[PDB]
Structure 1
Amino acid sequence: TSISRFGVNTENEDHLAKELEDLNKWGLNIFNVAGYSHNRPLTCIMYAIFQERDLLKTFRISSDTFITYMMTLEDHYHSDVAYHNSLHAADVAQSTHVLLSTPALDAVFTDLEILAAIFAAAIHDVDHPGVSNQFLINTNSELALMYNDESVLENHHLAVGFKLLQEEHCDIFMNLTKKQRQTLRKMVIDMVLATDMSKHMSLLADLKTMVETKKVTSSGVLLLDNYTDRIQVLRNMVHCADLSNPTKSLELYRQWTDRIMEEFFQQGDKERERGMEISPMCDKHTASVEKSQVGFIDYIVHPLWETWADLVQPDAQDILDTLEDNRNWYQSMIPQ
């Protein structure tokens, strides 16, 4: 019954429950969730989200099918990769869950859209090996061979997430109609493929056009009256969630920074041993963590969240303010 209540075994049910009081807040601490869930933050958080949104009831998903599926998905996240592990997946899922409740996006999305977006967040980095697409391509890896060099990892994450539905008692979409399943599959593919950084400038241009053309209901919510507008918001939302580390509390952000750099430097080490050129930010002998975080925010993270903020204005004002404070803290840490 730790299991019926939470995703998972804990023993530390009291502390776990306490952390999960922050389920609907940007300030939830996923590192604490992992510590109190026997390191199953992704199973735990997904279960809590799904109960909070009543999705198990709406889509006739038994608890046991859900947990079996989530534990399997979670087992396919590599625990020896410093950043792209199930902690990151749990964070993006939880962050997407919070974005979906933005007041300006109230009752805009259907249940199935909500299901697709959270599922997409959960699966979006599954079986990540801890190296970039470019590394896999340049080392002639099997994955790059499978996917003809194109969004290699993102294609793989989708394939794994969807293949795992076929394991015994894992079919969480068994009681959707055929058409819901087709629709959700289309949405999920769209969202996960959108997480490829090579598409970031396209997503952002489309987001800016949504801002420039936005329409507000009498009730004060955004009017999104076709599928194209809806999926475009959703894919930008999961992209935002994926790029949300610098907008959390500084104590959280710093831990995420430490892990992404540890992962980068390990790829740099493999590049160095093979005699390759070392990818940007991957050489531990020369990289500046601080310049790199401030560059990343200035060129990628702030323009995205600023545009997100303009779309739901003023509902992301506090996220934007925290990003800007964290950016200035890292800036002030640049030597000289």
Structure 2
Amino acid sequence: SIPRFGVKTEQEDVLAKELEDVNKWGLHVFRIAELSGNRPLTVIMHTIFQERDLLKTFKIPVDTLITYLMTLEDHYHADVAYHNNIHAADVVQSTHVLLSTPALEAVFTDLEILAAIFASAIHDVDHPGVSNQFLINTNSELALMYNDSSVLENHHLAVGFKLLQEENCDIFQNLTKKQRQSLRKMVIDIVLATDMSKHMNLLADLKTMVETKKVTSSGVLLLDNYSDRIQVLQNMVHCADLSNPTKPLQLYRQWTDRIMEEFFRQGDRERERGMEISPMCDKHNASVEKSQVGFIDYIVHPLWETWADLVHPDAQDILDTLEDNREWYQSTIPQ
């Protein structure tokens, strides 16, 4: 074998070429997971941080960043089919694309950008692949600690920040206390808003925002106060989290297979424990296609429609894709 010396390996080259689509909706995220040796979150976060010059801006040592990223990625569960490091990388990358929408040019500070991306990276870390309700009903220690209230989402935040304390992991070591307090508050506000129980209120407020919407010649959005800025950042990451149906069908179905696998597993555990089987978790009584059409009509389309308005016309193709995917699942309901 010939030692490599200063030139990319061929796999690393194939990976680098795939990462050329980091700014595009529909990145081959599963290919990247494989090509990186199951390091999609590390490699995608690193690319995005370099692209946005965040290492220089926040004086983040490169070895510290990579060590933290690997450590964070190591705390997503390989055995969990959907809420794993690939989902995390996908939400990071989707948020990264949404941040660069023309309607949002020059709106956000570098610290706000850092908050949205870091929030996306950590938002599901240490997910056990079961719901808050399952954790509550079993009297889990986690549910006890967090008083049955946004149990997992509190946990995701606690773990994401806690991991900064591991050896050479404090990527925020050079931020001032003011910078850290601000970042921290934003990240917390964003991740706690990913609790699906908060969706309706979150959407309600986004609608209210679109109504009173203000722009400036060129048509870029105007956002004066923390309340408006964080609202947009919350809904942005929430859209990224619910972005699977807006991706090309080939990607969307892979996400659907994975979440169903994860749900059915929870249902098998509920059944064997003699518990009521949670909605959509019963593999003996599933209607996958009906359920996706319902997911889209009642949750995903309403959200994205409202986002497309806020940033009109930036999100038109994303919305078109969503509607094509809705039609595909509709036509697949076996009747």
TM-score tier (shorter): over 0.9
Corresponding residue for residue 163 of structure 2 = 164
Describe the superposition over 1:109-129 as per-residue Cα deviations: whole angstroms up to 9, x where unpaired: 000000000000000000000
Letter in 1 for 2:260: M
SS of 1:310 mapped into structure 2: helix
Letter in 2 for 1:57: K
Following the alignment from structure 1 to structure 2, what is the Cα–Cα distance between the partners of residues 255 and 27? 13
Provide TM-score, normalisation by structure 1: 0.97
Following the alignment from structure 1 to structure 2, what is the Cα–Cα distance between the partners of residues 17 and 11? 10
The question of 1:77 aligning with 2:68 is answered no
Deviation, structure 1 residue 218: 1.4
Corresponding residue for residue 66 of structure 2 = 67
Describe the superposition over 1:77-103 as per-residue Cα deviations: whole angstroms up to 9, x where unpaired: 000000000000000000000000000
The question of 1:299 aligning with 2:275 is answered no
Corresponding residue for residue 112 of structure 1 = 111
- Residues 31-180 of structure 1 correspond to what in structure 2 (within 5 A)? 31-180=30-179
Letter in 2 for 1:307: T
Describe the superposition over 1:19-41 as per-residue Cα deviations: whole angstroms up to 9, x where unpaired: 10100000211001101100100
Provide TM-score, normalisation by structure 2: 0.97
- CA gap of 1:11–1:62, structure 2 versus 1, over 3 A, is farther
Corresponding residue for residue 276 of structure 1 = 275
Deviation, structure 1 residue 14: 1.6
Following the alignment from structure 2 to structure 1, what is the Cα–Cα distance between the partners of residues 98 and 325? 20
Following the alignment from structure 1 to structure 2, what is the Cα–Cα distance between the partners of residues 271 and 113? 40
Q: What is the root-mean-square deviation of aligned Cα atoms in Å? A: 1.3
In the TM superposition, structure 1's runs of 4+ consecutive aligned residues that sit over 3 Å from their partners are none
Corresponding residue for residue 212 of structure 1 = 211
- CA gap of 1:11–1:162, structure 2 versus 1, over 3 A, is farther
Following the alignment from structure 2 to structure 1, what is the Cα–Cα distance between the partners of residues 33 and 21? 14
Deviation, structure 1 residue 17: 1.1
SS of 2:219 mapped into structure 1: coil
Deviation, structure 1 residue 219: 2.8
The question of 1:267 aligning with 2:266 is answered yes
Corresponding residue for residue 11 of structure 2 = 12
Letter in 2 for 1:163: K
SS of 2:218 mapped into structure 1: coil
Letter in 2 for 1:171: D
SS of 1:21 mapped into structure 2: helix
Describe the superposition over 1:142-174 as per-residue Cα deviations: whole angstroms up to 9, x where unpaired: 110110100000000000000000111000001
Q: Percent identity?
A: 87
Corresponding residue for residue 27 of structure 1 = 26
Letter in 2 for 1:36: L
Describe the superposition over 1:245-301 as per-residue Cα deviations: whole angstroms up to 9, x where unpaired: 000000000000000000000000000000011001100000111011110000000
Following the alignment from structure 1 to structure 2, what is the Cα–Cα distance between the partners of residues 156 and 110? 27
Letter in 1 for 2:241: D
The question of 1:236 aligning with 2:240 is answered no
Following the alignment from structure 2 to structure 1, what is the Cα–Cα distance between the partners of residues 58 and 133? 39
Letter in 1 for 2:289: E
Following the alignment from structure 1 to structure 2, what is the Cα–Cα distance between the partners of residues 5 and 288? 50
Following the alignment from structure 1 to structure 2, what is the Cα–Cα distance between the partners of residues 172 and 231? 22
SS of 1:12 mapped into structure 2: helix
Letter in 2 for 1:187: M
Letter in 1 for 2:89: A
Unpaired runs of at least 5, structure 1: none
Describe the superposition over 1:282-321 as per-residue Cα deviations: whole angstroms up to 9, x where unpaired: 0000011101111000000000000000110110000000
Following the alignment from structure 1 to structure 2, what is the Cα–Cα distance between the partners of residues 191 and 176? 20
